[PDB]
Structure formats: C-alpha cells, structure tokens
Design an enzyme around this catalytic site. Structure first.
Site, PDB file in Angstrom:
ATOM      1  N   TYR A   1      -2.387  26.227  10.225  1.00 48.82           N
ATOM      2  CA  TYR A   1      -3.034  26.956  11.270  1.00 48.82           C
ATOM      3  C   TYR A   1      -4.536  26.664  11.336  1.00 48.82           C
ATOM      4  O   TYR A   1      -5.045  26.471  12.405  1.00 48.82           O
ATOM      5  CB  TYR A   1      -2.843  28.436  11.049  1.00 48.82           C
ATOM      6  CG  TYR A   1      -3.550  29.366  12.001  1.00 48.82           C
ATOM      7  CD1 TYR A   1      -3.120  29.525  13.302  1.00 48.82           C
ATOM      8  CD2 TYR A   1      -4.601  30.164  11.554  1.00 48.82           C
ATOM      9  CE1 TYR A   1      -3.733  30.436  14.166  1.00 48.82           C
ATOM     10  CE2 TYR A   1      -5.246  31.040  12.403  1.00 48.82           C
ATOM     11  CZ  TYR A   1      -4.845  31.178  13.703  1.00 48.82           C
ATOM     12  OH  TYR A   1      -5.481  32.080  14.524  1.00 48.82           O
TER      13      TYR A   1
ATOM     14  N   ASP B   1     -11.552  35.466   7.061  1.00 41.85           N
ATOM     15  CA  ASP B   1     -11.118  34.787   5.862  1.00 41.85           C
ATOM     16  C   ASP B   1     -11.887  33.527   5.577  1.00 41.85           C
ATOM     17  O   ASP B   1     -12.006  33.063   4.390  1.00 41.85           O
ATOM     18  CB  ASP B   1      -9.620  34.409   5.936  1.00 41.85           C
ATOM     19  CG  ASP B   1      -9.286  33.588   7.208  1.00 41.85           C
ATOM     20  OD1 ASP B   1      -9.030  34.190   8.252  1.00 41.85           O
ATOM     21  OD2 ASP B   1      -9.398  32.388   7.107  1.00 41.85           O
TER      22      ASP B   1
ATOM     23  N   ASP C   1     -18.203  43.927  16.900  1.00 42.33           N
ATOM     24  CA  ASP C   1     -17.203  43.813  17.891  1.00 42.33           C
ATOM     25  C   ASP C   1     -17.468  42.491  18.660  1.00 42.33           C
ATOM     26  O   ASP C   1     -18.607  42.224  18.999  1.00 42.33           O
ATOM     27  CB  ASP C   1     -17.397  44.975  18.844  1.00 42.33           C
ATOM     28  CG  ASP C   1     -16.507  44.865  19.997  1.00 42.33           C
ATOM     29  OD1 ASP C   1     -15.313  44.800  19.730  1.00 42.33           O
ATOM     30  OD2 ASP C   1     -16.966  44.741  21.148  1.00 42.33           O
TER      31      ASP C   1
ATOM     32  N   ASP D   1      -9.826  33.188  16.385  1.00 42.42           N
ATOM     33  CA  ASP D   1      -8.885  33.379  15.303  1.00 42.42           C
ATOM     34  C   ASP D   1      -8.665  34.896  15.175  1.00 42.42           C
ATOM     35  O   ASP D   1      -9.098  35.540  14.221  1.00 42.42           O
ATOM     36  CB  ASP D   1      -9.382  32.729  14.032  1.00 42.42           C
ATOM     37  CG  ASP D   1      -8.441  32.873  12.905  1.00 42.42           C
ATOM     38  OD1 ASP D   1      -7.271  33.312  13.116  1.00 42.42           O
ATOM     39  OD2 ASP D   1      -8.853  32.521  11.782  1.00 42.42           O
TER      40      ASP D   1
ATOM     41  N   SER E   1      -6.304  38.454  15.041  1.00 43.64           N
ATOM     42  CA  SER E   1      -5.037  39.058  14.681  1.00 43.64           C
ATOM     43  C   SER E   1      -4.202  39.269  15.976  1.00 43.64           C
ATOM     44  O   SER E   1      -4.553  38.775  17.084  1.00 43.64           O
ATOM     45  CB  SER E   1      -5.324  40.375  13.919  1.00 43.64           C
ATOM     46  OG  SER E   1      -5.757  40.038  12.594  1.00 43.64           O
ATOM     47  N   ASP E   2      -3.119  40.017  15.815  1.00 44.26           N
ATOM     48  CA  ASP E   2      -2.263  40.451  16.927  1.00 44.26           C
ATOM     49  C   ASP E   2      -2.865  41.560  17.782  1.00 44.26           C
ATOM     50  O   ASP E   2      -3.778  42.271  17.331  1.00 44.26           O
ATOM     51  CB  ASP E   2      -0.869  40.927  16.413  1.00 44.26           C
ATOM     52  CG  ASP E   2      -0.194  39.891  15.524  1.00 44.26           C
ATOM     53  OD1 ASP E   2       0.076  38.714  15.941  1.00 44.26           O
ATOM     54  OD2 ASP E   2       0.015  40.265  14.381  1.00 44.26           O
TER      55      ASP E   2
HETATM   56  N1  LIG Z   1       1.294  37.734  13.553  1.00 48.02           N
HETATM   57  C1  LIG Z   1       0.477  36.569  13.628  1.00 48.02           C
HETATM   58  C2  LIG Z   1      -0.820  36.848  12.859  1.00 48.02           C
HETATM   59  C3  LIG Z   1      -1.827  35.681  13.050  1.00 48.02           C
HETATM   60  C4  LIG Z   1      -3.173  35.931  12.362  1.00 48.02           C
HETATM   61  C5  LIG Z   1      -4.182  34.758  12.329  1.00 48.02           C
HETATM   62  C6  LIG Z   1      -5.403  35.423  11.743  1.00 48.02           C
HETATM   63  N2  LIG Z   1      -5.659  35.497  10.396  1.00 48.02           N
HETATM   64  C7  LIG Z   1      -6.794  36.205  10.211  1.00 48.02           C
HETATM   65  C8  LIG Z   1      -7.510  36.535   9.053  1.00 48.02           C
HETATM   66  C9  LIG Z   1      -8.691  37.301   9.185  1.00 48.02           C
HETATM   67  C10 LIG Z   1      -9.127  37.757  10.454  1.00 48.02           C
HETATM   68  C11 LIG Z   1      -8.424  37.416  11.622  1.00 48.02           C
HETATM   69  C12 LIG Z   1      -7.249  36.621  11.508  1.00 48.02           C
HETATM   70  N3  LIG Z   1      -6.352  36.132  12.437  1.00 48.02           N
END
Ligand SMILES: NCCCCCc1nc2ccccc2[nH]1
Ligand SMILES: NCCCCCc1nc2ccccc2[nH]1
Lengths: 281, 281
Positions: A62, A87, A138, A156, A158-159
């Site tokens: 990813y 991260d 934000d 990048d 989250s959901d």
């Molecule tokens: N259900 C799919 C989840 C995808 C997440 C990708 C991702 N991983 C992360 C780590 C820290 C902050 C924002 C983030 N976005």
C-alpha cells in the site's frame, strides 16, 4: 493465545482475524481507540477503532503504490502533502526522492504518530528527515489555511466511519484541487472494489466535477478487507497517472518490494464488472 | 446467527469468517467433509474439509481467469480436460466456446458434483452440455490411462492438504505434459503469493523440467486466503500464455464479469518481491 478479529458495518457478514502473539499498547486517544499487537505471522499490527491500519508484513504494498504512482508521473515534484498517514509509511517512500524539498503531513491524532515512532521504527523512520514537517490538525482546516500549493497530495485516510469521515465528500475534493499546482496530482485511498462499489462511484463523481482525469487503481494487500484496496487518482492534465515518466533506478529504490514500472500500469486494468459500473459517471 | 471460520495450518495465524444465514447440507463423503451454507452477504458457499472452495459472489473471478487465459491463447482448442473442479465453474466458462468439441472432467469425489448440481445451479449448468463427459476417478490414474491428448488442461485443484495432495509433485507434471498436444497448454491453481512462496517456487521448478515456458499470474478474489490466488501457466511453445490471440466478442461472452483482453496480460505483472524470488529457478 487469543485472536484479534476485525468486524465492521462497512463489511457486514465478513471478518478477518490474526492470532495475537502479544499485546504491546492500547489507549483511548481524543479521537479513537488505538491498539498495537505483535501477531504470530504478520509481525506488528496497528489497529484504530477496531480496524487494521497496517501490518509490518504487507504494509510495503500500500505505501509503495500510493507513493510511487503519483511520484513517478510528477516530473520534478518539490513540495508534497500527506493527509492522514500518521504511521509514516508514505513519508518513508517520499524521502527516497532526492529532488523533493519539503514534505508536509497533516494528521489529526498525534498518538498515531508517537506510537508509530516507538513501535514501528521501520515505518516511522522518515520522521527524522529534515524536510519533513508535521501538523496536528484537521485536514479540512489545514487545506483551508495552507498558503503553499503542492506538486502531489496523497490522502492516506482511514475509512469513512471515524475521524476520516470528512475526507469522503465534494467539499474536500475542492480544497485539494485548490491546494495543488496547476499540473499537480492527488491520489487517495478509495476502498475495495469487491464491496464498496457505491462509494467508489461517488468518489469518482466528486472528483470529476473538478479534475479533468480521474482514474482508479487496485492494490493487492491481504490485511485490508477483501484483500485489496484502491487508489483514486486525480489529474489536472489530459494525460493522467497510468504511465510513469521515470524509472526508479537509483540506490534508494533498490529495496522496493512491490512497485515496479510494469505493475504501475497493470494496477489500472480493472475487473470487467467495475468498468461497467463506472462507465457513465 | 453463527459464523463460519476458515482455519488452516496452510495459513497459520490468520482466519477468514463469513456470517451464516443458514446451513443447507453437510456430509462426510468417502474423501472429505462437505458443507454448503447460505452466507448473509456472499451468497451460497461450498466448503471442503473446512476450507472455502467457492462462493457465489466472487467465483466468476477465479473461473473466468483460469479458463479464458489459456482458451484465448490456444488457437482452435477442440478437446479440453478439467482436473478437479467438480463444482462445474470451469466447465460453464468452457461451454461458451462454440469451437470446443469435447470437455472431459476428472473429479475424484462425485458428491462435490452432485451437491453443485442441486445447490449451485448457476455454476453447475454446463453439466447439461452434450460435449461434457464426467469421470469419477483419481487424476493420476485418469492421466495414465487416457488415450486422447488435449489442447488445454485446467487443473482446478483444492489445496495440497487433502485428496489434491497428489497434484503438487513432479510426476504429475510429467503426465500432464504427455497428455497435451505438442502445442498444448496447462494452467493450474497455484496458491497465494502472500504466503505460499515456497510452494510457488517448487511448482515452477517442477514445471520447468518439462515445459519450455512457465509463467505465473495472479487473481484478486476475496474468499480465498489473503484475497488472491495464482495460476501456474505452462506452455510447450516459445511464446507462452501472457498475450491473448483473440477477443471474446460473441454474444456468449457478453456476461463476463472479470476477464477482459487488457487484464489478461496485467495479471502476469507481479509484485517486485515475487519476481526476485523466482528469478534464478
Ligand atoms: N479498511 C481499510 C483501512 C485502510 C487504512 C489505510 C491507512 N492507514 C493509516 C494509518 C494511520 C493513519 C491513517 C491511515 N490510513
Ligand atoms: N485455499 C484455496 C482453495 C482453492 C480451491 C479452488 C477449487 N475449488 C474447487 C471446487 C471443487 C473441486 C476442486 C476445487 N478447487
């Protein structure tokens, strides 16, 4: 030994589980629940509000794709924004480009960054790079206030259930558009084609109001739901993001584990039913 | 409502679960445990020895790719063998080719076929086609005894734990080679690049003793472990299976949901770490 199980109303009827070798840290931040564990087979795992955010074993898929798609197409990118991504994985991949002068990151929850610096040192190592600047804030507000414009923005997120809810609407895509240079590019996390086709269609519609080319690519990664996740790819230019303009041949890229020149374009060849769904958008 | 959970020593430390809407049939055959259930979100599901074999929601991905890769490359295929595959999915995709004259299937466990004919009618519908002939028999024995040679052989095997154990060794690949026409092709199920790289390397080695081109392709399918499964692709010719020689344009192919001309070649563009693992085989 117990198992961790990932349930959600965003993927009803299915769950994915990893066996726990040991719990390393849990807290409730101001924004979400944070859990970090060592899995028996996927290394360390980060969990936010009960959803897996990364594992050491597969995170390179990813992060490499999200970063090197736009960065091999941008000719001479100097300023790059990462939205979310506390991260540090995207940042790690960005720092490999000697030409980049500034990297800004906007992440609302500083606990994510700090936990990554302590527990995931091969992911958060880019934070030592002098070009990196961190903003705890934000994303909407950040985009409204920033004076600079960027060569590439990588969302990048989250959901849509959580603090990333605000990053999946029309207004947001306006701000991204205004924050990009006139030939600039944005890529954003855009969910699994196996289950969230309604969302993919909506995001593409939102993007198409503003950008002249909106394209979608897929990444194989076992610890996201359904084993894949896509990239919404937004271009202000006729030409788009499907074809790289350079090869990653210098010594800083020798360690890449997923991305290469061929599989950049291959990621945009999508299953027939998805083409059909998004054809008349 | 309960959940079904898929555990295995072939994917230690991980499990995938589907919620059960209702159990439809269970038995212990002479060869394995058979379970059929209606899931809440993936439709009906077939389970053999506690491992998912297909679901209605996603089976088209694996069956289309396994079939139309070799069948669009074979010029004028007349005789085709399916090994395993009692569910009928491959056969359904084969019957779409008007040029095919005979389709043989060799499946050791007739209960799989019968359960598919009763419970999965949109998968097992090819069994009505007059060109289809069924043999209930060990594949090794079948291959040793068959007098005919084939244009294409498709090995739709389960995993190496079970009756499909015999289908993952050198001897077997010899018999396949001897059973093919001199320009013939074999594709075989060949496991997930995320976890079974040792196996993928072994299978490729086995194939390379005999065949002059051995190539590997990946399919995205959420209900197999790690969300993908690959195809070991064996060619007696210089040219291989990466490029189709026809387009599937007649009315019988209008309903395809995964395969198309572009994504045939794209499936062979693999993650960088896998290229490296199999480079000096
Ligand atoms: N259900 C799919 C989840 C995808 C997440 C990708 C991702 N991983 C992360 C780590 C820290 C902050 C924002 C983030 N976005
Ligand atoms: N763990 C991956 C399992 C892949 C199974 C593919 C498959 N599905 C089948 C249905 C009936 C008979 C043989 C089969 N082989």
């Amino acid at each position: 030994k117990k198992w961790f199980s990932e349930f959600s109303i965003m993927w009803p009827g299915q769950a994915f589980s990893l066996k726990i070798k040991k719990i390393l840290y849990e807290t409730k931040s101001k924004y979400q629940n944070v859990l970090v564990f060592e899995s028996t087979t996927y290394g360390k795992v980060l969990v936010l509000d009960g959803v897996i955010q990364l594992t050491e074993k597969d995170e390179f898929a990813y992060h490499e794709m999200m970063t090197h798609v736009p960065m091999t197409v941008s000719k001479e990118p100097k300023n790059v924004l990462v939205v979310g991504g506390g991260d540090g994985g995207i940042i790690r991949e960005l720092c490999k480009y000697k030409s980049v002068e500034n990297i800004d990151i906007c992440e609302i929850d500083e606990t994510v960054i700090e936990v990554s610096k302590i527990y995931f040192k091969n992911i958060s190592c880019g934070y030592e790079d002098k070009r990196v600047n961190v903003f705890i804030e934000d994303a909407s507000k950040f985009l409204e206030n920033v004076t600079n414009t960027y060569d590439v923005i990588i969302v990048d997120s989250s959901d849509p259930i959580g603090p990333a809810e605000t990053l999946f609407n029309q207004n947001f895509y306006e701000k991204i558009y205004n924050a990009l240079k006139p030939n600039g590019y944005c890529v954003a996390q855009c969910e699994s084609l196996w289950i969230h086709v309604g969302t993919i269609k909506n995001m593409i519609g939102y993007a198409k109001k503003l950008f002249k080319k909106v394209e979608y690519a897929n990444i194989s990664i076992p610890t996201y739901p359904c084993g894949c996740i896509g990239i919404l790819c937004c271009s202000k230019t006729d030409t788009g993001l499907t074809k790289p303009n350079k090869k990653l041949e210098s010594k800083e890229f020798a360690d890449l584990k997923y991305y290469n020149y061929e599989n950049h374009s291959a990621a945009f060849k999508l299953p027939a039913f998805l083409l059909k769904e998004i054809e008349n958008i």
